């Protein structure tokens, strides 16, 4: 969570009022809510998986408590495989 | 001082056979004898042909050339270029 | 066997076509179509001068007791030159059964009230007045209910916009509640949600 | 020369000043049904729409911005516009023209159409 | 011929050879289909179209099988439901789960076919199949795992496109569509197979996530990137302009549209002019109110008169804003009118408007034998017509010729060459090419806007006419005569009576110089005398807005309601879909507001009004959708042979020889970041 | 065409006059009964205004719906059915001025 | 929760905060989506 020129803190959308906006004016006596957590830098945080096999399925982790099970193909060795909804990444070995 | 003439004539009504005579016999000869003087043919449709003679500063007059024939149109024509 | 589909009772079927048949023979002067539904409900089209006529002899016994207006209402069709259809429920405690009658107008042919006849009607009819523009003649007292005092326009009507041309709101300059036109904050987003495909080839129109 | 403008209710400007178009809509390019494109519809002109100061939601002050009328033929709506006194222009329906579509053309023994893959 | 058949009992007469499909539309039944496109070839993969005839006992393939007269069409029956529930089965089988997160969702014929001909269960057991992604281009998403193989993206490359690059490798449940080796698809009918491609493998990279089908408002409109007049639906969510979609016009375009057309949308989003602007004291240009800036330009229009007030108009402006101002100049007593493209004026030149229309329309290509191309690469300037070139040359057996630089235009063509000679050996008939021409029955010559520009224009037009006058003398209805505009607003200019090209402006320098969107950059301050006082009209500034003393912001083709003429002649109306950034007005609007501050108030006060003042100028303009037309060939050929210009013997190149120049041309595409990312895309 | 109340325009003159002559006689009663702060001339003005809005309706049967809906408002007036603000509500008090040359209309917003 | 703690993530909040409303706190609406439409800039140089 960066911090704009202005003082603001700077959303995970990157939304922050510049200074000619005076729609920062609603923060004067109150604050203003950002969530300190960002999704990017979470989920880059997470390892990548290796599996052994050319196709390999994501869901989401708790079965019916995550995502539509979806499957990804590993067979280009440049880039991991990416879950469209979980977001893991997943690379064959070697 | 003539700026432009706007002639309006439609295509397959009999009130436009004599301007349409017009155009394609003496349209020629006109533009020969007015070299830089726009004549604009345009089509015009269920509505009677119209000659339009827009002037210096934008004055404009309109004179109907329904059923009128080749020479009529030719006389309208010299009239507003002899004005 | 087939416990999705909903069950099918011919008996019903047949019953409410032959009364609707009975029901057509009695009155040619005034009925134009008379139609069963699939899910056994009866519908008798009638001319708009024989709403009092066909709904009075409804009520009285020719083999048909319908002495209880169930709802009378209107469906607003601006496609149809009569872009109002009146539509009366009746149902007859004798027989156990309900019918409905239905009929048309535009918005400057009075229709003929039926409050001699149900006397139920005089709230409904006046509820069409307010909503749609049905206009009904030799109604006891026809006024708007449902609608503000000095509500102009007439909704449900397809035309009106579900907003509205009027917003209300306290001015303190007059210390008065006061009028203005209709400014939204978020705009209704309006969905296209018809899908391309046909769903229903029963109901398939002529391509004419 | 029905005139129900009096009787609608409809504050004058959006009587007058609003043109209303008629049209068959057309196919949605992104799918092949053909559906949506058989009802005649009657939609109003846009109007402004500004972002609300607080959370930057789309406000309008266009009444009938959302109304939209489906009807059977193109008369039947030129009727309806006429009765309620809004000006209105009229689109043409635009059917697909007849194609000759044969697959033995893609296999032509002389012509151009035979198909590489 | 008729034939009489039956779809499920009801008699409906069909020619020979129709298919069983195309039966079923003249009933009304639209028989399911993944594969089949009218416009494509047939293929007859998806099996979607399974349907069963009377007393026979397989089910046919209702795209791919000719009618037999008596046969019986049973749509409904059990076996076709039967059929085509299967057949959904097997294409749901290894799909993937990816509806809520796919950009086609909520407008996927899969989808709908699935609710509408398909089970509502699964009884697949076993593990889908995951295909690698391929890279085809910084335009096209690709998802292949979501590919049903329904081939509709190979066959229009191969045939509408005509750039062989996309097809099937493998085979069995491996097969997959794509290009083998990693290179890039490009072309100006690219983005058109994310349109044609029933499912979301393939999707737009741009409009990718930003918005799902039921939201969008979707507005009518014509496109004015070029002069082809293609039909399009601007979608807008909630005041914003989302995406646009080409929208059916058999004659004009049949269900296409250009990349730039597709994708130049977002440079309407940038660069965008939303207050008007005067120059300070230090020379700077600042903010201003609207009543001070059109007051300063009333103050200098009323200070000078004739030709010290000139006017140049851009591409992109509308005939409503042109006769506003042509009307204000005029009252001024100024006839400097100028389009930034040059039309010879010697002869007819706009007196006729045969002579400066596409007389053979779109439509008309099919038609003709023989197409003569003369310095134009119809491809880049109008790629509609080079898809309809490449249509009747598919089917038609059309024979094109090019004379000019060679260029790749998607079809086989005869190169004459490039010396603008060629143009006298055919008219003289010593070219071999000129007999060919004469034994054409339906003869076709185009010559483009873009050589007319060029400083031989008006020899090289008269050429072009002595080989129409020949071709008439060796053999009506059909007109062997047009000019390919590259430009949306030369039409209705010259139409309107703006003069073609600068060149009077260059004679006559003026005082007071207004810009209408002039981007081109054909006059500038050097040009113009030192205190020339410059007016910029537009939607973005460009060019001619840094070099203005007044900026008038103006609102951009989806911001109004105006009449843009195509090349063909044919008037269509765009429709309003956006209003316009801050505080941009209409363009009608802000001249006929300075008029009323300058003294001199235009007669009209409403966009009706402007409309039949633009009937009065021209009949034509008002008529939306019309190509009647008229044929005065002979009188201006005529016109013709009483000057005689020579022309220089500078080689004939088109301005745009390969698809880097197409992506930024004007204003719009210019200020786009996506036709600038297609430029690194090509040129690296 | 079936007649509502009339068969001839000149019949639903008549009860556009009676309708009128009502409205005139209720006008001092609602001033006094609502404490409108308005004059009696200004409400008959308004009930003048109100009145030539209708004018151009050339149909018998719309001048007699009209009728109706002018009779329903004023029973709703004679009674208290309608509070000071319902009675106001024709007096466009809050809503400002809008301009109608079009150079105005230029210069506040698109709109046409 | 002492008998059967709940799941431990790293992003649920280690210190609960009660009803802020009417307090330095308090939460204030914004939007958060970027400006969507970009103005020209003018040029630094006078001509
Ligand atoms: C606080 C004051 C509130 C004022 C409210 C007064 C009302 O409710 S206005 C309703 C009255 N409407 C009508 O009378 C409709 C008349 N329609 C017509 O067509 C007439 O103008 C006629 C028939 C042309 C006759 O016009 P003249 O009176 O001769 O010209
Ligand atoms: S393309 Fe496939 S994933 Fe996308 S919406 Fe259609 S069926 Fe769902
Ligand atoms: S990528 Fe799309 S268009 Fe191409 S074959 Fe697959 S589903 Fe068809
Ligand atoms: S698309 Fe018709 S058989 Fe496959």
């Known amino acids: ?94 | ?83 | ?208 | ?117 | 011929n008729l034939i009489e058949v039956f779809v499920d009992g009801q008699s409906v007469m069909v020619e020979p050879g129709t298919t069983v499909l195309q039966a079923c539309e003249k009933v009304g039944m639209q028989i399911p289909r993944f594969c089949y496109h009218e416009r494509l070839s047939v293929a007859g993969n998806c099996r979607m179209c399974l349907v069963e005839i009377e007393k026979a006992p397989k089910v046919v393939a209702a795209c791919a099988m000719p009618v037999m007269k008596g046969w019986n069409i049973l749509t409904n029956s059990e076996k076709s439901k039967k059929a085509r529930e299967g057949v959904m089965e097997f294409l749901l089988a290894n799909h993937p789960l990816d509806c809520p997160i796919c950009d086609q969702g909520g407008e996927c014929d899969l989808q709908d076919q699935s609710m509408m001909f398909g089970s509502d269960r699964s009884r697949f057991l076993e593990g889908k199949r995951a295909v690698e992604d391929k890279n085809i281009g910084p335009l096209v998403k690709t998802i292949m795992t979501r590919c049903i193989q329904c081939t509709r993206c190979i066959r229009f490359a191969s045939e509408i496109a005509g750039v062989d690059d996309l097809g099937t490798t493998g085979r069995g449940n491996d097969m997959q569509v794509g290009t083998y080796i990693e290179k890039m698809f490009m072309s100006e009918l690219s983005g058109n197979i994310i349109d044609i491609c029933p499912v979301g493998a393939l999707t737009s990279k741009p409009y990718a996530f930003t918005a799902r089908p039921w939201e969008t408002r979707k507005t009518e409109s014509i496109d004015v990137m070029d002069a082809v007049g293609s039909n399009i639906v601007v979608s807008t969510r909630t005041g914003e302009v989302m995406r646009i979609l080409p929208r059916m016009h058999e004659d004009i375009n049949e269900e296409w549209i250009s990349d730039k057309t597709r994708f130049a949308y977002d440079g309407l989003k940038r660069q965008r002019l939303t207050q008007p602007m005067i120059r300070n004291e230090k020379g700077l240009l600042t903010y201003t109110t609207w009543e001070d800036a059109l007051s300063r330009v009333a103050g200098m229009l009323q200070s000078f008169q004739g030709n010290d007030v000139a006017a140049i108009a851009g591409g992109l402006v509308d005939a409503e804003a042109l006769v506003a101002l042509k009307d204000l100049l005029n009252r001024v007593d100024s006839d400097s009118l100028c389009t930034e493209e040059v039309f010879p004026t010697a002869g007819a030149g706009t007196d006729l408007r045969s002579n400066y229309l596409l007389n053979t329309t779109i439509a008309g290509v099919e038609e003709a034998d023989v197409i003569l191309l003369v310095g134009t690469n119809p491809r880049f300037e109008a790629p509609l017509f080079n898809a309809r070139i490449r249509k009747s040359w598919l089917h038609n057996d059309l024979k094109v010729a090019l004379i000019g630089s060679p260029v790749d235009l998607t079809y086989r063509y005869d190169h004459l060459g490039d010396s603008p000679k060629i143009l006298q050996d055919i008219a003289s008939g010593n070219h071999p090419f000129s007999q060919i021409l004469k034994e054409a029955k339906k003869p076709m010559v185009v010559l483009g806007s873009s050589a007319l520009q060029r400083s031989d224009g008006t020899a090289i037009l008269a050429a072009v006419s002595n080989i129409a006058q020949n071709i008439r003398l060796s053999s009506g209805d059909w007109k062997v005569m047009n000019i390919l505009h590259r430009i949306a607003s030369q039409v209705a200019a010259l139409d309107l009576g703006y003069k073609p090209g600068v060149e009077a402006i260059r004679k006559n320098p003026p005082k007071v110089l207004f810009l209408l969107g002039a981007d081109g950059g054909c006059i500038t301050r050097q040009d113009l005398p030192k205190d020339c006082f410059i007016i910029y009209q537009g939607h973005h500034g460009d060019v001619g807005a840094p070099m203005a003393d007044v900026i008038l912001p103006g609102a951009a083709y989806t911001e109004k309601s105006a009449t843009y003429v195509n090349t063909e002649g044919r008037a269509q109306q765009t429709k309003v879909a956006v209003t316009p950034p801050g505080l941009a007005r209409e363009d009608w609007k802000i001249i006929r507001a300075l008029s009323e501050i300058a003294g001199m108030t235009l007669p009209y006060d409403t966009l009706d009004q402007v409309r039949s003042r633009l009937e009065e100028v021209s009949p034509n303009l008002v008529r939306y959708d019309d190509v009647e037309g008229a044929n005065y060939f002979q009188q201006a050929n005529e016109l013709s042979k009483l000057v005689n210009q020579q022309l220089l013997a500078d080689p004939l190149v088109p301005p745009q020889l390969t698809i880097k120049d197409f992506y930024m041309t004007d204003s719009i595409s210019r200020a786009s970041q996506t036709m600038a990312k297609c430029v690194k895309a090509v040129t690296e | ?112 | 929760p002492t008998t059967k703690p709940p799941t431990a993530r790293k992003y649920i909040w280690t210190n609960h905060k009660f009803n802020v409303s009417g307090t330095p706190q308090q939460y204030v609406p914004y939007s958060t989506t970027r400006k969507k439409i970009q103005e020209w800039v003018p040029p630094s140089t006078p001509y």
């Open chain 2, 1 to 83: 001082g003539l700026r432009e003439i706007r002639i309006h004539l439609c295509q397959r009504s009999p009130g436009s056979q004599g301007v349409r005579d017009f155009i394609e016999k003496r349209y020629v000869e006109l533009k020969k004898a007015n070299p830089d003087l726009p004549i604009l043919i345009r089509e015009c449709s269920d509505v009677q042909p119209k000659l339009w003679a827009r002037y210096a500063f934008g004055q404009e007059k309109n004179v109907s050339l329904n059923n009128f024939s080749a020479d009529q149109v030719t006389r309208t024509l010299e009239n507003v270029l002899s004005g």
């Open chain 1, 1 to 94: 969570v960066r911090t704009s020129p202005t003082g603001e803190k700077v959303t995970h959308t990157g939304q922050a009022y510049d200074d000619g906006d005076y729609r920062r004016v609603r923060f004067s006596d109150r604050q203003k809510e950002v969530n300190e957590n960002f999704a990017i830098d979470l989920i880059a945080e997470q390892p990548v998986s290796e599996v052994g096999s050319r196709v390999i399925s994501c869901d989401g982790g708790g079965g019916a408590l995550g995502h539509p099970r979806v499957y990804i193909n590993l067979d280009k060795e440049t880039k991991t495989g990416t879950c469209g909804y979980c977001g893991l990444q997943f690379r064959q070995p070697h």
């Open chain 6, 1 to 112: 065409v079936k007649p509502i109340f009339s068969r001839d325009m000149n019949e639903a003159k008549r009860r556009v006059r009676e309708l009128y002559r009502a409205w005139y006689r209720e006008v001092p009663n609602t001033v006094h009964l609502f404490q409108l702060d308005i004059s009696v001339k200004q409400g008959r003005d308004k009930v003048r205004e109100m009145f030539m809005k209708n004018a151009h309706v050339t149909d018998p049967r719309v001048v007699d719906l009209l009728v109706i809906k002018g009779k329903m408002e004023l029973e709703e007036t004679i009674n208290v059915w309608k509070q000071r603000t319902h009675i106001m509500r024709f007096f466009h008090e809050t809503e400002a001025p809008r301009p109608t040359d079009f150079l105005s209309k230029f210069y506040v917003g698109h709109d046409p």
């Open chain 4, 1 to 117: 020369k029905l005139d129900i403008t009096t009787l609608t209710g409809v504050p004058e400007e959006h009587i007058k000043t609003r043109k209303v178009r008629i049209f068959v809509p057309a196919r949605n390019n992104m799918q092949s049904g053909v559906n949506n494109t058989k009802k005649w519809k009657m939609e109003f002109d846009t109007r402004e729409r500004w972002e609300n100061p607080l959370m930057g939601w789309s406000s309008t002050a266009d009444p009938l911005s959302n109304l939209v009328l489906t009807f059977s033929t193109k008369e039947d709506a030129v009727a309806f516009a006429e009765k309620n006194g809004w000006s209105f222009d009229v689109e043409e329906r635009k059917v697909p023209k007849p194609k000759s579509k044969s697959y033995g053309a893609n296999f032509s023994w002389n012509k151009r159409t035979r198909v590489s893959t």
């Open chain 3, 1 to 208: 066997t087939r416990p999705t589909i909903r069950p099918r009772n011919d008996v019903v079927h047949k019953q409410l076509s032959a009364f609707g048949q009975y029901v057509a023979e009695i009155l040619p002067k005034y009925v134009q179509q008379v139609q069963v539904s699939c899910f056994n409900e009866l519908e008798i089209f009638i001319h708009p001068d024989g709403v009092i006529p066909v709904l009075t002899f409804l009520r009285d016994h020719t083999n048909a007791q319908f002495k209880s207006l169930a709802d009378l209402t209107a469906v607003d069709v601006p496609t149809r030159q009569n872009r109002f259809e009146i539509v009366y429920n009746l149902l007859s405690l004798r027989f156990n059964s309900r019918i409905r009658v239905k009929t048309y107008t535009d918005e400057l042919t009075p229709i003929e009230s039926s409050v001699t006849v149900y006397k139920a009607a005089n709230w409904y009819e006046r509820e069409i007045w307010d909503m749609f523009g049905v206009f009904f003649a030799n109604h006891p007292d026809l006024r708007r209910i449902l609608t503000d005092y000095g509500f102009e326009g007439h909704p449900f009507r397809k035309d009106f916009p579900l907003s509205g041309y009027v917003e209300l709101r306290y001015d303190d300059e007059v210390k008065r509640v006061v009028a203005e036109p209709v400014e939204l904050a978020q705009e209704f987003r309006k969905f296209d949600l018809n899908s391309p495909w046909e769903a229903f080839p029963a109901y398939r129109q002529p391509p004419e």
